[PDB]
């Protein structure tokens, strides 16, 4: 059973998507704005993703969450999934 998770980037932007591993980052997941916030709910598979905010058409990762170099040499972020 996925786990319907919380994803929430708090670094501003005038659009915010997400993507990630939990897909093979085949799309862009619109996060919804709340007051300085943009959300989304993620059905996540237990284990763990990687993933990568796609903000005013730039890639970006929260800094306020780990972070795990890709072998593309990017920075992602990584979310544990119990």
Do not use: C, M
């Amino acid at each position: 059973q996925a786990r319907p998770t919380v994803i929430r980037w708090s670094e501003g932007g005038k659009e915010v998507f997400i993507s990630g591993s939990f897909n093979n980052w085949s799309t862009k997941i619109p996060l919804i704005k709340s007051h300085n916030d943009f959300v989304a709910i993620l059905d996540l598979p237990e284990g763990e993703h990687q993933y990568k905010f796609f903000v005013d058409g730039q890639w970006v990762h929260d800094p306020s969450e780990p972070v795990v170099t890709s072998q593309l040499g990017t920075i992602n972020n990584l979310i544990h999934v119990k």
